């Protein structure tokens, strides 16, 4: 368990580690927005 002051942020901490994968997919959103030029 996190220290009990931080336990409000338990839903947010549960989704934090997947954030790096979103950077890989964000590179494709950006390339699609520029037409894969």
């Amino acid at each position: 368990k996190l220290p009990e002051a931080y336990a409000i942020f338990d839903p947010l901490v549960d989704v934090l580690p997947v954030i790096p994968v979103l950077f890989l997919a964000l590179a494709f959103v950006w390339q699609a927005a520029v037409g894969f030029r």
Partner: protein
């Protein structure tokens, strides 16, 4: 946009990071932002691991890989690896997570806002890939950084609390290392040890005095070679040996990383010293040795004479000899007789497993350890069903050693593929035929026929 389409850059979108080869400002930003991704994950995973963590369950039952790395450093653990404090795991997670916003900022800054090239702005931060002296200078700068990092581990072990020591007498405990092994016949002796069974090369390192003294040696070697590469230029034999370009230097690091990932895969699989079994679970060899120990203990409690019990094949059902004659556990686990662990080594005499020690001196903590390790063998499914492939659903377990070994085998394999890809491409690019064969001077057309 400079170099951000295929016509101007020569590279398609799917090879679009190759457009950064000669744009050192944006290329720096790519590396700093990617460094922030690593540090983000190290922080975010630790906080995830800590938020899911039950202190009364073992770490290896809970799908944790980063908390055991912190615990092995000596933080937050007591005797036998029980967690005495979760605050050091919270600090390590938070400080990494905050620092990745810092690395993320400068990565984003150099990659979108800063100068595309550093060469006009600064001669010190600018570089040609072909400037061999600038290449060895930055190599020397990073070698010093790594050597200081290796001495940070020595400083943790000697002057800032110690390390978790699974071989500490009277059970595993955090122990301050006072006399690290500085003798180079021991330290470099692991380098000449065979990688095969019973030897195991550097994976066999079995005591923290060897671990700490090796990192002393590595830290001083990396500082020496750091200062050496800052003050030298490559000799002529190295200039005529290597390809001198950015893609080539990438490929050398790719082969280096692939080799290191294969090494770490074997480290986590076999070594129970720097990956303690209280944190990572038993090794593969350990659990098989622990099953043979469990059924020796139970059957000898029922009255069996385990030294004289013949198996179906005529080998000893519990105890037999290794090919050099040491007394070892029988059954299929004869292959794992090189296993060494703190729960087993009390039973082992000069010629192997001691029958008098086995009859009299097996403590209840060893029997508890053998049963726990036998039932937490690193075998399980991709959906994390523990045990053999034929086991029914109930137990939710895949050992961290299996997760760490399999992941790092995959990564080390693809990094070897990347090494081959980039090393072949760097040779063809330096020799000038990476875009294909010139029709007006095709090389095979001026060679004689083979027949």
């Amino acid at each position: 946009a400079t170099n951000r389409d295929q016509e101007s850059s020569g590279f398609a979108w799917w090879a679009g990071n190759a457009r950064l080869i000669n744009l050192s400002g944006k290329l720096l930003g790519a590396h700093v932002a990617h460094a922030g991704l690593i540090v983000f994950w190290a922080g975010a995973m630790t906080l995830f691991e800590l938020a899911h963590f039950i202190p009364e369950k073992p770490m290896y039952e809970q799908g944790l890989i980063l908390i055991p790395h912190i615990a092995t450093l000596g933080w937050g653990v007591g005797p036998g690896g029980e967690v005495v404090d979760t605050f050091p795991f919270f600090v390590v997670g938070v400080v990494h997570l905050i620092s990745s916003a810092v690395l993320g900022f400068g990565g984003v800054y150099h990659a979108i806002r800063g100068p595309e090239t550093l060469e006009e702005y600064s001669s010190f931060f600018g570089y040609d890939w072909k400037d061999k002296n600038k290449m060895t200078t930055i190599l020397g700068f990073h070698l010093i950084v790594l050597g200081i990092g290796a001495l940070l581990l020595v400083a943790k072990a000697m002057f800032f609390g110690g390390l978790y020591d699974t071989w500490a007498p009277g059970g595993g405990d955090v122990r301050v290392i006072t006399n690290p092994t500085l003798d180079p016949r021991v330290i470099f002796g692991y380098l000449l040890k065979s990688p095969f069974g019973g030897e195991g090369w550097i994976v066999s390192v079995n005591n923290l005095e060897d671990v700490v003294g090796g990192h002393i040696w590595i830290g001083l070697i990396c500082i020496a070679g750091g200062i050496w590469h800052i003050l030298t230029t490559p000799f002529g034999w190295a200039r005529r040996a290597f390809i001198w370009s950015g893609e080539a230097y990438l490929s050398y690091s790719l082969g280096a990383l692939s080799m290191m990932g294969f090494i770490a895969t074997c480290f986590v699989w076999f070594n129970n010293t720097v990956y303690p079994s209280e944190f990572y679970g038993p090794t593969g060899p350990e659990a098989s040795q622990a099953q043979a120990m469990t059924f020796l203990i139970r059957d000898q409690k029922l009255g069996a004479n385990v030294g004289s019990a013949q198996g179906p094949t005529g080998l000893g059902k519990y105890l037999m000899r290794s090919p050099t004659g040491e007394i070892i556990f029988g059954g299929e686990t004869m292959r794992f007789w090189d296993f060494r662990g703190p729960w087993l080594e009390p039973l082992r005499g000069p010629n192997g497993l001691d029958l008098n020690k086995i009859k009299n001196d097996i403590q209840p903590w060893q029997e508890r350890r053998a049963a726990e390790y036998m039932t937490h063998a690193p075998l399980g499914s991709l959906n994390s069903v523990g045990g053999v492939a034929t086991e029914i659903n109930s137990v939710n377990f895949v050992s961290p050693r299996s997760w760490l070994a399999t992941s790092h085998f995959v990564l080390a394999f693809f990094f070897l593929v990347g090494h081959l890809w980039h090393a072949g491409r760097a040779r063809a690019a330096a020799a000038g035929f990476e875009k294909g064969i010139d029709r007006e001077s095709e090389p095979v057309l001026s060679m004689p026929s083979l027949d």
